[PDB]
Enzyme design. Structure first.
Site, PDB file in Angstrom:
ATOM      1  N   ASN A  44     -28.599  25.246  10.084  1.00 12.99           N
ATOM      2  CA  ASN A  44     -27.581  26.110   9.259  1.00 12.99           C
ATOM      3  C   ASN A  44     -28.345  27.016   8.258  1.00 12.99           C
ATOM      4  O   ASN A  44     -29.316  26.622   7.786  1.00 12.99           O
ATOM      5  CB  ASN A  44     -26.668  25.418   8.611  1.00 12.99           C
ATOM      6  CG  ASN A  44     -25.577  25.826   7.917  1.00 12.99           C
ATOM      7  OD1 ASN A  44     -25.264  27.021   8.162  1.00 12.99           O
ATOM      8  ND2 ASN A  44     -24.838  25.231   7.223  1.00 12.99           N
ATOM      9  N   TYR A  76     -20.090  38.571   1.210  1.00 11.61           N
ATOM     10  CA  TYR A  76     -19.897  37.383   1.014  1.00 11.61           C
ATOM     11  C   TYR A  76     -20.375  37.187  -0.461  1.00 11.61           C
ATOM     12  O   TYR A  76     -21.428  38.115  -0.956  1.00 11.61           O
ATOM     13  CB  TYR A  76     -20.733  36.319   1.660  1.00 11.61           C
ATOM     14  CG  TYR A  76     -21.065  35.031   1.049  1.00 11.61           C
ATOM     15  CD1 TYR A  76     -22.096  34.484   0.617  1.00 11.61           C
ATOM     16  CD2 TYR A  76     -19.872  34.296   1.333  1.00 11.61           C
ATOM     17  CE1 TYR A  76     -22.323  33.252   0.066  1.00 11.61           C
ATOM     18  CE2 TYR A  76     -20.113  32.817   0.793  1.00 11.61           C
ATOM     19  CZ  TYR A  76     -21.344  32.757   0.203  1.00 11.61           C
ATOM     20  OH  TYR A  76     -21.437  31.093  -0.559  1.00 11.61           O
ATOM     21  N   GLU A  85     -15.091  31.843  -4.227  1.00 14.09           N
ATOM     22  CA  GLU A  85     -16.088  32.111  -3.119  1.00 14.09           C
ATOM     23  C   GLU A  85     -15.239  32.988  -2.198  1.00 14.09           C
ATOM     24  O   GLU A  85     -14.101  32.689  -1.798  1.00 14.09           O
ATOM     25  CB  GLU A  85     -16.489  30.934  -2.397  1.00 14.09           C
ATOM     26  CG  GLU A  85     -17.527  31.073  -1.233  1.00 14.09           C
ATOM     27  CD  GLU A  85     -17.825  29.719  -0.482  1.00 14.09           C
ATOM     28  OE1 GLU A  85     -17.028  29.150  -0.316  1.00 14.09           O
ATOM     29  OE2 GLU A  85     -19.075  29.743  -0.108  1.00 14.09           O
ATOM     30  N   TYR A  87     -15.025  36.038   1.401  1.00 10.53           N
ATOM     31  CA  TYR A  87     -15.909  36.324   2.868  1.00 10.53           C
ATOM     32  C   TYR A  87     -14.878  37.412   3.046  1.00 10.53           C
ATOM     33  O   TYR A  87     -13.685  37.308   3.496  1.00 10.53           O
ATOM     34  CB  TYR A  87     -15.585  35.200   3.569  1.00 10.53           C
ATOM     35  CG  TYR A  87     -16.281  33.977   3.467  1.00 10.53           C
ATOM     36  CD1 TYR A  87     -15.698  33.134   2.611  1.00 10.53           C
ATOM     37  CD2 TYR A  87     -17.542  33.480   4.182  1.00 10.53           C
ATOM     38  CE1 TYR A  87     -16.236  31.592   2.465  1.00 10.53           C
ATOM     39  CE2 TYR A  87     -18.046  32.248   3.772  1.00 10.53           C
ATOM     40  CZ  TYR A  87     -17.511  31.507   3.052  1.00 10.53           C
ATOM     41  OH  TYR A  87     -17.961  30.416   2.670  1.00 10.53           O
ATOM     42  N   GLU A 176     -24.955  34.674   9.185  1.00  7.53           N
ATOM     43  CA  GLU A 176     -24.987  33.118   9.058  1.00  7.53           C
ATOM     44  C   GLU A 176     -25.113  32.737  10.442  1.00  7.53           C
ATOM     45  O   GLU A 176     -24.573  33.164  11.560  1.00  7.53           O
ATOM     46  CB  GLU A 176     -23.477  32.595   8.440  1.00  7.53           C
ATOM     47  CG  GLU A 176     -23.580  31.129   8.347  1.00  7.53           C
ATOM     48  CD  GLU A 176     -22.674  30.447   9.772  1.00  7.53           C
ATOM     49  OE1 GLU A 176     -22.372  31.437  10.576  1.00  7.53           O
ATOM     50  OE2 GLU A 176     -22.493  29.181   9.455  1.00  7.53           O
TER      51      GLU A 176
END
Length: 189
Positions: A44, A76, A85, A87, A176
């Site tokens: 990851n 992000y 948070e 996105y 990511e």
């Protein structure tokens, strides 16, 4: 075996995190450019360049995004007070990263409808330690790998759904990958 790298490079903030350094290579390049290659369908990671602190800014990005499997390309970032948070997802591979979040409308900006979602993360890792915090998602319907993002239009759309954003912490254009492979070279400005 984890690795986290943050700093300033080429005039820009950067951040790279991975739980498998052997299968992912992050390269800082000049100005707002970075490259990431990942292989072996193992590990990851999240990395990219941008700003700290973030702001309501127009983020321009261009480059090449070539995922093979689970991956996304997103603006992000985080705020504090309150802790949020967020996105702005511009592209993704085989999995929609918004899955499991609650549908919360639509906003049309920068050439596409974005689907809005909200979620709560309960005692989860945060920039402030283990916390319960809100997440906002905008997911672009018309996937792309270069363009401009008017972040303030998303911030305003989210503020009509739930908590307003707090004081900005970092804000990056992130690539990511999750147990996949691919390569990307992106330049932010």
């Amino acid at each position: 075996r984890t690795q986290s790298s943050t700093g300033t490079h080429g005039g820009y903030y950067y951040s790279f995190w991975t739980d498998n350094p052997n299968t992912v290579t992050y390269t800082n390049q000049n100005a707002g450019q970075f490259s990431v290659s990942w292989s072996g369908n193992q590990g990851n990671f999240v990395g990219g360049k941008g700003w700290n602190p973030g702001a309501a800014r127009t983020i321009k990005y261009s480059g090449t995004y070539n995922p093979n499997g689970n991956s996304y390309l997103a603006v992000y970032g985080w705020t504090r007070n309150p802790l949020i948070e967020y996105y702005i997802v511009e592209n993704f591979g085989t999995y929609n990263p918004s899955s499991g979040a609650t549908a919360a409308g639509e906003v049309t900006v920068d050439g596409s409808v974005y689907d809005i979602y909200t979620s709560t993360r309960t005692n989860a890792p945060s920039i402030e330690g283990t916390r319960t915090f809100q997440q906002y998602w905008s997911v672009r319907r018309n996937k792309r790998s270069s363009g401009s993002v008017n972040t303030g239009a998303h911030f305003n759309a989210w503020s009509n759904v739930g908590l307003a954003l707090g004081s900005h912490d970092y804000q990056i254009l992130a690539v990511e990958g999750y147990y996949s492979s691919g390569s990307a070279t992106m330049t932010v400005s």
